[PDB]
GROMACS .gro file of C-alpha atoms in nm:
model
  498
    1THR     CA    1  -3.414   0.211   0.335
    2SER     CA    2  -3.480   0.071   0.689
    3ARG     CA    3  -3.711  -0.238   0.745
    4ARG     CA    4  -3.771  -0.121   1.107
    5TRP     CA    5  -4.147  -0.206   1.070
    6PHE     CA    6  -4.063  -0.580   1.113
    7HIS     CA    7  -4.047  -0.701   1.478
    8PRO     CA    8  -3.880  -1.051   1.491
    9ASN     CA    9  -3.941  -1.147   1.859
   10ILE     CA   10  -4.299  -1.029   1.937
   11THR     CA   11  -4.644  -1.181   2.026
   12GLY     CA   12  -5.000  -1.091   1.912
   13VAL     CA   13  -5.083  -0.916   2.243
   14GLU     CA   14  -4.746  -0.730   2.250
   15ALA     CA   15  -4.813  -0.606   1.891
   16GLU     CA   16  -5.164  -0.481   1.993
   17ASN     CA   17  -5.023  -0.297   2.301
   18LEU     CA   18  -4.744  -0.130   2.091
   19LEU     CA   19  -4.992  -0.005   1.825
   20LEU     CA   20  -5.239   0.124   2.091
   21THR     CA   21  -4.973   0.306   2.306
   22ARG     CA   22  -4.688   0.401   2.063
   23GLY     CA   23  -4.891   0.428   1.739
   24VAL     CA   24  -5.195   0.607   1.587
   25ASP     CA   25  -5.465   0.525   1.323
   26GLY     CA   26  -5.276   0.405   1.015
   27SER     CA   27  -4.983   0.256   1.212
   28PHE     CA   28  -4.856  -0.088   1.104
   29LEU     CA   29  -4.601  -0.363   1.179
   30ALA     CA   30  -4.508  -0.708   1.037
   31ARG     CA   31  -4.442  -1.007   1.268
   32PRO     CA   32  -4.362  -1.383   1.233
   33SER     CA   33  -4.619  -1.656   1.324
   34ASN     CA   34  -4.879  -2.088   1.365
   35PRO     CA   35  -4.508  -2.127   1.257
   36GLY     CA   36  -4.397  -2.070   0.896
   37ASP     CA   37  -4.628  -1.773   0.818
   38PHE     CA   38  -4.637  -1.393   0.895
   39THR     CA   39  -4.891  -1.138   1.033
   40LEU     CA   40  -4.955  -0.772   0.934
   41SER     CA   41  -5.094  -0.588   1.242
   42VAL     CA   42  -5.259  -0.253   1.146
   43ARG     CA   43  -5.437   0.007   1.368
   44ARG     CA   44  -5.773   0.136   1.235
   45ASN     CA   45  -6.030   0.353   1.425
   46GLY     CA   46  -5.876   0.279   1.769
   47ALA     CA   47  -5.872  -0.099   1.703
   48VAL     CA   48  -5.601  -0.349   1.592
   49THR     CA   49  -5.663  -0.561   1.276
   50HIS     CA   50  -5.446  -0.869   1.203
   51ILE     CA   51  -5.393  -0.966   0.834
   52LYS     CA   52  -5.238  -1.311   0.771
   53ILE     CA   53  -4.948  -1.348   0.522
   54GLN     CA   54  -4.864  -1.704   0.408
   55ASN     CA   55  -4.557  -1.836   0.222
   56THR     CA   56  -4.522  -2.206   0.126
   57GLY     CA   57  -4.213  -2.126  -0.085
   58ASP     CA   58  -4.356  -1.949  -0.395
   59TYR     CA   59  -4.468  -1.597  -0.282
   60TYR     CA   60  -4.596  -1.392   0.016
   61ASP     CA   61  -4.977  -1.432  -0.007
   62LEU     CA   62  -5.154  -1.158   0.193
   63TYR     CA   63  -5.515  -1.256   0.291
   64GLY     CA   64  -5.767  -1.051   0.090
   65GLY     CA   65  -5.480  -0.883  -0.095
   66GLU     CA   66  -5.202  -0.953  -0.348
   67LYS     CA   67  -4.896  -1.184  -0.388
   68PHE     CA   68  -4.545  -1.037  -0.336
   69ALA     CA   69  -4.175  -1.125  -0.378
   70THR     CA   70  -4.067  -0.967  -0.042
   71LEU     CA   71  -4.235  -0.814   0.267
   72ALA     CA   72  -4.053  -0.485   0.180
   73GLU     CA   73  -4.219  -0.482  -0.168
   74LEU     CA   74  -4.559  -0.557   0.001
   75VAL     CA   75  -4.512  -0.255   0.239
   76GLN     CA   76  -4.384  -0.024  -0.045
   77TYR     CA   77  -4.691  -0.117  -0.260
   78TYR     CA   78  -4.960  -0.036   0.003
   79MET     CA   79  -4.782   0.282   0.129
   80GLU     CA   80  -4.787   0.413  -0.234
   81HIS     CA   81  -5.137   0.269  -0.320
   82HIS     CA   82  -5.379   0.359  -0.032
   83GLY     CA   83  -5.711   0.235  -0.179
   84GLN     CA   84  -5.585  -0.117  -0.266
   85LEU     CA   85  -5.597  -0.300   0.072
   86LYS     CA   86  -5.947  -0.389   0.199
   87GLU     CA   87  -6.121  -0.625   0.450
   88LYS     CA   88  -6.365  -0.914   0.365
   89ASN     CA   89  -6.655  -0.659   0.380
   90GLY     CA   90  -6.484  -0.397   0.159
   91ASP     CA   91  -6.360  -0.148   0.425
   92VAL     CA   92  -6.021   0.009   0.329
   93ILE     CA   93  -5.714  -0.071   0.549
   94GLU     CA   94  -5.456   0.213   0.542
   95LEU     CA   95  -5.078   0.151   0.579
   96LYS     CA   96  -4.957   0.502   0.676
   97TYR     CA   97  -4.705   0.497   0.967
   98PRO     CA   98  -4.453   0.209   1.019
   99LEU     CA   99  -4.392   0.124   1.389
  100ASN     CA  100  -4.012   0.095   1.436
  101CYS     CA  101  -3.855  -0.202   1.621
  102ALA     CA  102  -3.580  -0.138   1.881
  103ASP     CA  103  -3.465  -0.508   1.893
  104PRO     CA  104  -3.117  -0.533   1.728
  105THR     CA  105  -3.105  -0.921   1.706
  106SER     CA  106  -3.152  -0.924   1.322
  107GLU     CA  107  -2.861  -0.677   1.265
  108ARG     CA  108  -2.534  -0.791   1.096
  109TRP     CA  109  -2.320  -0.582   1.338
  110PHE     CA  110  -2.498  -0.715   1.653
  111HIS     CA  111  -2.324  -1.008   1.827
  112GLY     CA  112  -2.507  -1.004   2.157
  113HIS     CA  113  -2.300  -1.210   2.394
  114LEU     CA  114  -1.941  -1.184   2.273
  115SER     CA  115  -1.684  -1.135   2.554
  116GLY     CA  116  -1.432  -0.845   2.551
  117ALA     CA  117  -1.444  -0.981   2.008
  118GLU     CA  118  -1.091  -0.836   1.966
  119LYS     CA  119  -0.970  -1.173   1.820
  120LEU     CA  120  -1.266  -1.185   1.573
  121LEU     CA  121  -1.180  -0.828   1.458
  122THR     CA  122  -0.810  -0.930   1.426
  123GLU     CA  123  -0.871  -1.259   1.233
  124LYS     CA  124  -1.169  -1.152   1.011
  125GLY     CA  125  -1.186  -0.769   1.040
  126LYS     CA  126  -1.039  -0.496   0.815
  127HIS     CA  127  -1.025  -0.109   0.826
  128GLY     CA  128  -1.364   0.021   0.944
  129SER     CA  129  -1.491  -0.321   1.065
  130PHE     CA  130  -1.725  -0.292   1.366
  131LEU     CA  131  -1.942  -0.495   1.610
  132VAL     CA  132  -2.194  -0.426   1.893
  133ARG     CA  133  -2.196  -0.660   2.197
  134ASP     CA  134  -2.374  -0.672   2.539
  135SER     CA  135  -2.173  -0.529   2.835
  136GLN     CA  136  -2.022  -0.788   3.075
  137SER     CA  137  -1.983  -0.573   3.393
  138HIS     CA  138  -2.297  -0.351   3.371
  139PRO     CA  139  -2.618  -0.534   3.255
  140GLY     CA  140  -2.832  -0.342   3.003
  141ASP     CA  141  -2.535  -0.148   2.855
  142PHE     CA  142  -2.356  -0.223   2.522
  143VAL     CA  143  -1.999  -0.208   2.375
  144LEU     CA  144  -1.906  -0.087   2.021
  145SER     CA  145  -1.576  -0.242   1.904
  146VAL     CA  146  -1.421  -0.085   1.587
  147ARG     CA  147  -1.102  -0.182   1.394
  148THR     CA  148  -0.885   0.092   1.231
  149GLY     CA  149  -0.552   0.076   1.044
  150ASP     CA  150  -0.371  -0.038   0.726
  151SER     CA  151  -0.359  -0.125   1.360
  152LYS     CA  152  -0.597  -0.105   1.665
  153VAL     CA  153  -0.936  -0.219   1.806
  154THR     CA  154  -1.117   0.074   1.978
  155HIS     CA  155  -1.393   0.009   2.235
  156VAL     CA  156  -1.678   0.263   2.279
  157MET     CA  157  -1.920   0.230   2.576
  158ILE     CA  158  -2.296   0.252   2.500
  159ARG     CA  159  -2.504   0.329   2.812
  160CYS     CA  160  -2.876   0.250   2.849
  161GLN     CA  161  -3.042   0.532   3.047
  162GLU     CA  162  -3.428   0.545   3.063
  163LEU     CA  163  -3.476   0.324   2.748
  164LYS     CA  164  -3.239   0.557   2.549
  165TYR     CA  165  -2.885   0.485   2.417
  166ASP     CA  166  -2.582   0.720   2.426
  167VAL     CA  167  -2.196   0.717   2.402
  168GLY     CA  168  -2.153   0.933   2.717
  169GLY     CA  169  -2.255   1.261   2.550
  170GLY     CA  170  -2.445   1.432   2.268
  171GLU     CA  171  -2.768   1.278   2.135
  172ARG     CA  172  -2.981   1.007   2.308
  173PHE     CA  173  -3.120   0.742   2.066
  174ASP     CA  174  -3.439   0.532   2.107
  175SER     CA  175  -3.264   0.219   1.965
  176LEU     CA  176  -2.914   0.072   1.897
  177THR     CA  177  -2.977   0.091   1.516
  178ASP     CA  178  -3.045   0.471   1.539
  179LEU     CA  179  -2.715   0.512   1.734
  180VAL     CA  180  -2.519   0.298   1.479
  181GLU     CA  181  -2.670   0.475   1.170
  182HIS     CA  182  -2.596   0.824   1.317
  183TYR     CA  183  -2.229   0.748   1.403
  184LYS     CA  184  -2.192   0.580   1.057
  185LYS     CA  185  -2.284   0.910   0.878
  186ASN     CA  186  -2.130   1.142   1.146
  187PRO     CA  187  -1.814   0.952   1.263
  188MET     CA  188  -1.655   0.963   1.611
  189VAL     CA  189  -1.310   1.126   1.644
  190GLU     CA  190  -1.056   1.005   1.907
  191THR     CA  191  -0.841   1.242   2.124
  192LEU     CA  192  -0.530   1.203   1.898
  193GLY     CA  193  -0.732   1.250   1.575
  194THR     CA  194  -0.818   0.888   1.481
  195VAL     CA  195  -1.155   0.870   1.295
  196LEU     CA  196  -1.383   0.585   1.416
  197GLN     CA  197  -1.538   0.518   1.072
  198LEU     CA  198  -1.804   0.243   1.063
  199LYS     CA  199  -1.787   0.117   0.701
  200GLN     CA  200  -1.872  -0.258   0.718
  201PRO     CA  201  -1.987  -0.509   0.989
  202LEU     CA  202  -1.799  -0.831   1.081
  203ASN     CA  203  -1.873  -1.127   0.848
  204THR     CA  204  -1.980  -1.432   1.056
  205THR     CA  205  -2.150  -1.643   0.779
  206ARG     CA  206  -1.849  -1.740   0.555
  207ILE     CA  207  -1.741  -2.104   0.614
  208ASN     CA  208  -1.489  -2.350   0.464
  209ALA     CA  209  -1.689  -2.595   0.242
  210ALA     CA  210  -1.524  -2.902   0.409
  211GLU     CA  211  -1.650  -2.777   0.754
  212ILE     CA  212  -2.023  -2.765   0.641
  213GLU     CA  213  -2.133  -3.053   0.876
  214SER     CA  214  -2.013  -2.861   1.188
  215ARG     CA  215  -2.184  -2.528   1.088
  216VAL     CA  216  -2.517  -2.704   0.999
  217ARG     CA  217  -2.494  -2.882   1.343
  218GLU     CA  218  -2.446  -2.542   1.523
  219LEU     CA  219  -2.736  -2.387   1.322
  220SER     CA  220  -2.954  -2.685   1.438
  221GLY     CA  221  -2.961  -2.088   1.441
  222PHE     CA  222  -3.101  -2.126   1.085
  223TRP     CA  223  -3.390  -1.886   1.172
  224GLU     CA  224  -3.164  -1.610   1.320
  225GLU     CA  225  -2.921  -1.630   1.022
  226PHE     CA  226  -3.213  -1.616   0.769
  227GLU     CA  227  -3.387  -1.317   0.940
  228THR     CA  228  -3.053  -1.123   0.933
  229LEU     CA  229  -3.045  -1.189   0.552
  230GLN     CA  230  -3.418  -1.088   0.530
  231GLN     CA  231  -3.333  -0.753   0.705
  232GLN     CA  232  -3.104  -0.669   0.404
  233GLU     CA  233  -3.401  -0.673   0.153
  234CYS     CA  234  -3.475  -0.295   0.204
  235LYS     CA  235  -3.147  -0.226   0.013
  236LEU     CA  236  -3.282  -0.424  -0.291
  237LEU     CA  237  -3.592  -0.208  -0.372
  238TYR     CA  238  -3.474  -0.144  -0.733
  239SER     CA  239  -3.680  -0.003  -1.027
  240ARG     CA  240  -3.943  -0.230  -1.196
  241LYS     CA  241  -4.120   0.034  -1.419
  242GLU     CA  242  -4.124  -0.177  -1.743
  243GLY     CA  243  -4.339  -0.448  -1.579
  244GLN     CA  244  -4.573  -0.181  -1.431
  245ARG     CA  245  -4.669  -0.061  -1.786
  246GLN     CA  246  -5.035  -0.124  -1.893
  247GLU     CA  247  -4.906  -0.293  -2.214
  248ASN     CA  248  -4.712  -0.545  -1.996
  249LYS     CA  249  -4.975  -0.608  -1.718
  250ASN     CA  250  -5.120  -0.926  -1.884
  251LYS     CA  251  -4.760  -1.052  -1.955
  252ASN     CA  252  -4.707  -1.110  -1.577
  253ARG     CA  253  -4.839  -1.423  -1.394
  254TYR     CA  254  -4.864  -1.213  -1.073
  255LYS     CA  255  -4.908  -0.832  -1.114
  256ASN     CA  256  -4.660  -0.749  -0.830
  257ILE     CA  257  -4.383  -1.010  -0.882
  258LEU     CA  258  -4.195  -0.805  -1.146
  259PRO     CA  259  -3.843  -0.814  -1.301
  260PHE     CA  260  -3.584  -0.542  -1.215
  261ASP     CA  261  -3.525  -0.295  -1.504
  262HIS     CA  262  -3.141  -0.320  -1.479
  263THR     CA  263  -3.134  -0.705  -1.513
  264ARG     CA  264  -3.452  -0.779  -1.721
  265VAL     CA  265  -3.425  -0.978  -2.046
  266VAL     CA  266  -3.489  -0.727  -2.327
  267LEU     CA  267  -3.643  -0.889  -2.637
  268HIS     CA  268  -3.539  -0.776  -2.988
  269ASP     CA  269  -3.659  -0.849  -3.350
  270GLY     CA  270  -4.025  -0.817  -3.242
  271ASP     CA  271  -4.344  -0.746  -3.440
  272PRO     CA  272  -4.381  -0.366  -3.503
  273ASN     CA  273  -4.760  -0.383  -3.574
  274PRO     CA  274  -4.734  -0.200  -2.890
  275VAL     CA  275  -4.454  -0.326  -2.656
  276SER     CA  276  -4.262  -0.633  -2.790
  277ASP     CA  277  -3.939  -0.610  -2.578
  278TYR     CA  278  -4.085  -0.738  -2.245
  279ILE     CA  279  -4.076  -1.075  -2.061
  280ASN     CA  280  -4.099  -1.141  -1.680
  281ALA     CA  281  -3.736  -1.268  -1.674
  282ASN     CA  282  -3.394  -1.158  -1.540
  283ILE     CA  283  -3.030  -1.232  -1.629
  284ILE     CA  284  -2.861  -1.386  -1.319
  285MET     CA  285  -2.480  -1.345  -1.307
  286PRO     CA  286  -2.277  -1.497  -1.018
  287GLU     CA  287  -2.052  -1.215  -0.884
  288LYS     CA  288  -1.868  -1.858  -1.622
  289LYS     CA  289  -2.229  -2.002  -1.609
  290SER     CA  290  -2.520  -1.754  -1.628
  291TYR     CA  291  -2.894  -1.809  -1.561
  292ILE     CA  292  -3.228  -1.666  -1.675
  293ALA     CA  293  -3.471  -1.676  -1.382
  294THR     CA  294  -3.829  -1.651  -1.515
  295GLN     CA  295  -4.196  -1.719  -1.428
  296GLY     CA  296  -4.410  -2.009  -1.554
  297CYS     CA  297  -4.544  -1.951  -1.908
  298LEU     CA  298  -4.883  -1.787  -1.970
  299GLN     CA  299  -5.060  -1.875  -2.301
  300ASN     CA  300  -5.004  -1.513  -2.424
  301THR     CA  301  -4.628  -1.529  -2.330
  302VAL     CA  302  -4.530  -1.872  -2.484
  303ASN     CA  303  -4.414  -1.698  -2.809
  304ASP     CA  304  -4.203  -1.448  -2.605
  305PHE     CA  305  -4.042  -1.738  -2.406
  306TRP     CA  306  -3.915  -1.907  -2.727
  307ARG     CA  307  -3.806  -1.564  -2.865
  308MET     CA  308  -3.590  -1.530  -2.547
  309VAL     CA  309  -3.437  -1.887  -2.569
  310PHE     CA  310  -3.339  -1.824  -2.938
  311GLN     CA  311  -3.206  -1.465  -2.883
  312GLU     CA  312  -3.002  -1.558  -2.570
  313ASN     CA  313  -2.869  -1.879  -2.742
  314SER     CA  314  -2.992  -2.088  -2.440
  315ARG     CA  315  -2.956  -2.468  -2.475
  316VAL     CA  316  -3.080  -2.589  -2.130
  317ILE     CA  317  -3.424  -2.534  -1.965
  318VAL     CA  318  -3.479  -2.613  -1.594
  319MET     CA  319  -3.852  -2.656  -1.509
  320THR     CA  320  -3.903  -2.708  -1.133
  321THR     CA  321  -4.286  -2.728  -1.131
  322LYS     CA  322  -4.575  -2.941  -1.263
  323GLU     CA  323  -4.816  -2.774  -1.513
  324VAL     CA  324  -5.094  -2.789  -1.245
  325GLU     CA  325  -5.042  -2.797  -0.863
  326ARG     CA  326  -5.332  -2.815  -0.608
  327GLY     CA  327  -5.581  -2.768  -0.898
  328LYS     CA  328  -5.415  -2.433  -0.988
  329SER     CA  329  -5.224  -2.338  -1.307
  330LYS     CA  330  -4.850  -2.281  -1.240
  331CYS     CA  331  -4.708  -2.309  -1.598
  332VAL     CA  332  -4.875  -2.370  -1.937
  333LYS     CA  333  -4.745  -2.635  -2.184
  334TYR     CA  334  -4.493  -2.434  -2.395
  335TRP     CA  335  -4.346  -2.755  -2.549
  336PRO     CA  336  -4.513  -2.995  -2.802
  337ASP     CA  337  -4.585  -3.370  -2.744
  338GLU     CA  338  -4.311  -3.633  -2.814
  339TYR     CA  339  -4.236  -3.667  -3.193
  340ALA     CA  340  -4.463  -3.363  -3.272
  341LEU     CA  341  -4.364  -3.030  -3.435
  342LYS     CA  342  -4.526  -2.701  -3.322
  343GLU     CA  343  -4.501  -2.336  -3.433
  344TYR     CA  344  -4.497  -2.063  -3.166
  345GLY     CA  345  -4.519  -1.738  -3.363
  346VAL     CA  346  -4.193  -1.694  -3.560
  347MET     CA  347  -4.035  -1.990  -3.369
  348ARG     CA  348  -4.061  -2.364  -3.445
  349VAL     CA  349  -4.014  -2.635  -3.176
  350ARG     CA  350  -3.969  -3.014  -3.239
  351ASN     CA  351  -3.986  -3.272  -2.955
  352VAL     CA  352  -3.721  -3.528  -3.064
  353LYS     CA  353  -3.720  -3.769  -2.763
  354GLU     CA  354  -3.857  -3.787  -2.405
  355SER     CA  355  -3.636  -3.968  -2.149
  356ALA     CA  356  -3.802  -4.035  -1.812
  357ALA     CA  357  -3.628  -4.073  -1.473
  358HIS     CA  358  -3.801  -4.101  -1.130
  359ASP     CA  359  -3.753  -3.732  -1.029
  360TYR     CA  360  -3.749  -3.572  -1.379
  361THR     CA  361  -3.825  -3.596  -1.755
  362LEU     CA  362  -3.566  -3.498  -2.018
  363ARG     CA  363  -3.711  -3.358  -2.342
  364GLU     CA  364  -3.478  -3.318  -2.644
  365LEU     CA  365  -3.622  -3.011  -2.822
  366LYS     CA  366  -3.521  -2.861  -3.161
  367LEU     CA  367  -3.566  -2.480  -3.176
  368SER     CA  368  -3.551  -2.288  -3.507
  369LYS     CA  369  -3.687  -1.969  -3.673
  370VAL     CA  370  -3.965  -2.019  -3.932
  371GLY     CA  371  -3.847  -1.938  -4.285
  372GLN     CA  372  -3.475  -1.992  -4.217
  373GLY     CA  373  -3.259  -2.295  -4.245
  374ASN     CA  374  -2.936  -2.326  -4.041
  375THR     CA  375  -3.085  -2.154  -3.739
  376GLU     CA  376  -3.169  -2.483  -3.567
  377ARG     CA  377  -3.021  -2.573  -3.228
  378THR     CA  378  -3.089  -2.840  -2.963
  379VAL     CA  379  -3.256  -2.711  -2.644
  380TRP     CA  380  -3.253  -2.963  -2.355
  381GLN     CA  381  -3.555  -2.938  -2.123
  382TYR     CA  382  -3.507  -3.079  -1.771
  383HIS     CA  383  -3.851  -3.103  -1.604
  384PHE     CA  384  -3.832  -3.179  -1.226
  385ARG     CA  385  -4.170  -3.332  -1.123
  386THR     CA  386  -4.117  -3.466  -0.765
  387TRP     CA  387  -4.090  -3.128  -0.580
  388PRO     CA  388  -4.371  -3.116  -0.314
  389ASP     CA  389  -4.671  -2.877  -0.341
  390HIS     CA  390  -4.571  -2.702  -0.013
  391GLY     CA  391  -4.223  -2.683   0.143
  392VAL     CA  392  -3.904  -2.860   0.026
  393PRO     CA  393  -3.801  -3.231  -0.036
  394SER     CA  394  -3.686  -3.424   0.277
  395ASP     CA  395  -3.378  -3.563   0.094
  396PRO     CA  396  -3.163  -3.340  -0.138
  397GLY     CA  397  -3.029  -3.641  -0.336
  398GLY     CA  398  -3.282  -3.615  -0.621
  399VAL     CA  399  -3.222  -3.238  -0.667
  400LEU     CA  400  -2.839  -3.281  -0.666
  401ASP     CA  401  -2.847  -3.574  -0.918
  402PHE     CA  402  -3.076  -3.361  -1.143
  403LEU     CA  403  -2.851  -3.047  -1.115
  404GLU     CA  404  -2.533  -3.255  -1.181
  405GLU     CA  405  -2.691  -3.381  -1.512
  406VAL     CA  406  -2.806  -3.021  -1.594
  407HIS     CA  407  -2.446  -2.896  -1.532
  408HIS     CA  408  -2.292  -3.175  -1.747
  409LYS     CA  409  -2.522  -3.095  -2.044
  410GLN     CA  410  -2.448  -2.716  -2.027
  411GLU     CA  411  -2.068  -2.780  -2.006
  412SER     CA  412  -2.082  -3.024  -2.305
  413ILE     CA  413  -2.248  -2.764  -2.538
  414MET     CA  414  -1.999  -2.521  -2.701
  415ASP     CA  415  -2.103  -2.148  -2.707
  416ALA     CA  416  -2.417  -2.219  -2.495
  417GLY     CA  417  -2.609  -1.922  -2.353
  418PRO     CA  418  -2.754  -1.878  -1.999
  419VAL     CA  419  -2.948  -2.168  -1.836
  420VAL     CA  420  -3.325  -2.092  -1.835
  421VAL     CA  421  -3.464  -2.169  -1.484
  422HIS     CA  422  -3.837  -2.141  -1.398
  423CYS     CA  423  -4.114  -2.249  -1.155
  424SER     CA  424  -4.444  -2.056  -1.096
  425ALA     CA  425  -4.345  -1.695  -1.001
  426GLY     CA  426  -3.978  -1.773  -1.073
  427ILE     CA  427  -3.838  -1.670  -0.731
  428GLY     CA  428  -3.882  -1.950  -0.472
  429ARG     CA  429  -3.785  -2.287  -0.628
  430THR     CA  430  -3.602  -2.102  -0.914
  431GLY     CA  431  -3.398  -1.902  -0.658
  432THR     CA  432  -3.325  -2.216  -0.450
  433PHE     CA  433  -3.205  -2.416  -0.760
  434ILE     CA  434  -2.979  -2.134  -0.894
  435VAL     CA  435  -2.816  -2.070  -0.547
  436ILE     CA  436  -2.751  -2.447  -0.496
  437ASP     CA  437  -2.593  -2.463  -0.848
  438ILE     CA  438  -2.374  -2.150  -0.779
  439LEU     CA  439  -2.247  -2.283  -0.439
  440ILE     CA  440  -2.185  -2.640  -0.571
  441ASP     CA  441  -1.998  -2.492  -0.876
  442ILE     CA  442  -1.746  -2.321  -0.638
  443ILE     CA  443  -1.670  -2.671  -0.491
  444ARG     CA  444  -1.659  -2.821  -0.850
  445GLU     CA  445  -1.366  -2.587  -0.942
  446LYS     CA  446  -1.190  -2.512  -0.606
  447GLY     CA  447  -1.243  -2.849  -0.430
  448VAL     CA  448  -1.370  -2.943  -0.079
  449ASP     CA  449  -1.131  -2.691   0.091
  450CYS     CA  450  -1.276  -2.352  -0.025
  451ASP     CA  451  -1.469  -2.055   0.126
  452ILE     CA  452  -1.851  -2.044   0.081
  453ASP     CA  453  -2.096  -1.777   0.208
  454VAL     CA  454  -2.467  -1.883   0.183
  455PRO     CA  455  -2.641  -1.544   0.271
  456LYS     CA  456  -2.387  -1.335   0.069
  457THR     CA  457  -2.463  -1.548  -0.243
  458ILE     CA  458  -2.845  -1.517  -0.185
  459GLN     CA  459  -2.816  -1.134  -0.137
  460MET     CA  460  -2.613  -1.109  -0.465
  461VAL     CA  461  -2.880  -1.316  -0.656
  462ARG     CA  462  -3.163  -1.111  -0.484
  463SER     CA  463  -3.010  -0.787  -0.629
  464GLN     CA  464  -3.070  -0.939  -0.980
  465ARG     CA  465  -3.433  -1.066  -0.922
  466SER     CA  466  -3.687  -0.975  -0.647
  467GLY     CA  467  -3.693  -1.221  -0.354
  468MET     CA  468  -3.480  -1.511  -0.485
  469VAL     CA  469  -3.511  -1.790  -0.217
  470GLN     CA  470  -3.853  -1.744  -0.049
  471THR     CA  471  -3.855  -1.939   0.282
  472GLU     CA  472  -3.639  -2.053   0.579
  473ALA     CA  473  -3.720  -2.415   0.469
  474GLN     CA  474  -3.557  -2.339   0.128
  475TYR     CA  475  -3.266  -2.165   0.312
  476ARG     CA  476  -3.214  -2.482   0.527
  477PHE     CA  477  -3.242  -2.699   0.209
  478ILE     CA  478  -2.955  -2.501   0.044
  479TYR     CA  479  -2.727  -2.589   0.343
  480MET     CA  480  -2.840  -2.958   0.338
  481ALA     CA  481  -2.779  -2.979  -0.043
  482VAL     CA  482  -2.419  -2.844  -0.004
  483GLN     CA  483  -2.361  -3.082   0.296
  484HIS     CA  484  -2.488  -3.385   0.093
  485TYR     CA  485  -2.267  -3.281  -0.206
  486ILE     CA  486  -1.956  -3.252   0.023
  487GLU     CA  487  -2.046  -3.593   0.182
  488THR     CA  488  -2.069  -3.767  -0.163
  489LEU     CA  489  -1.727  -3.628  -0.275
  490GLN     CA  490  -1.572  -3.728   0.064
  491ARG     CA  491  -1.702  -4.089   0.019
  492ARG     CA  492  -1.578  -4.103  -0.346
  493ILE     CA  493  -1.223  -4.004  -0.231
  494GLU     CA  494  -1.237  -4.270   0.050
  495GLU     CA  495  -1.365  -4.534  -0.201
  496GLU     CA  496  -1.050  -4.478  -0.416
  497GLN     CA  497  -0.822  -4.480  -0.103
  498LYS     CA  498  -0.975  -4.803   0.044
   0.00000   0.00000   0.00000
């Protein structure tokens, strides 16, 4: 869609002035920061109301509202459901008109201060590759550089006249984004007939895995790269109708954090005597090893969880949360005690042995269908217990050691199904763990000298489940986990050499 309602470089007073001069009653905007959190500024009856949105790494928690996977899903929900958002008193807050941001800093095509850019379009660029940079000679103006061929880099001047942008004729646009989007749909034609088609921006995130230390150093950067990735979320507003059904409302831990219809795990062989095909879970495919990203079990969904594990032929479970965190339920006990046997509907689970490490507990479980012999399989449960209540761990060593053991178990089991990964909502920690495993797996196969793209991988995983990887802290942790993994392999090679 757009995501123009989010202003990345704004203050509380600037937000109030914009809503009172450029907006009307029902106008709204989202803004960052109190660092780490977000604020929803809404105009109501000639006054500005600020609603706090907090995210510790699990979900976007709007004060006196609901929990959401993305800020785009939060906005889409209240724009479609008017009588849902209310104050502490009970007075309804209406989200009617989004206030568009003119700042192009969070755009993929915007490079700000590149110099007369041709080399970057020659080395990285392809046919239709384009970038927008600040003008060197005339301050305030901009330059559009576009590559065309099988052959040439064409420069188009963008003038800034009375807070409006133009290419020297035609229409005058309020922002750089409006100019870019118009000339993307209606392309520019050169004097000799060459079409200046704007198909894709220049990729500046892809790095060679061996050169991770240098990129992390330059990003220490991480905020600007993450916000650019966050701006892409408006393109991931896929259908979630199955989870929105009244039959499935109590099957979701959080009413709004729902699985996409195109990737959801569809359950079969259910009880005929309502809906028996639903579970808040999605099949994650890296575009070898597949994953099922799901929420923490609810007592009414424990039977559906085991139905999924059996149906999908899954042999490894990754639990990245404690049962209770900060006195709040995050996941119910879906496994029996050590040496005990428990029946969960049509499924039977046996806890063979519990092996405890400092960061995790390994539980050897035996899953089978009640009434059938030769249906039994070993399901290995890896329960990470040291992850902090808020934020991410300071050292990625424990997570990497855990994931390396998870990988080695999956690889050792012949004909094993997708790896079940879950936390509370199944998006924050779950998303972080899956992304780290995908990126590390590229290095496992291709070696230290291979191309890796952190935001591209996150965007691909986000198209399969709503808001995979929740915070900038998690985003930073993904980079630090890859860097630590590269460092360990580098030392192991040097140990053999020396």
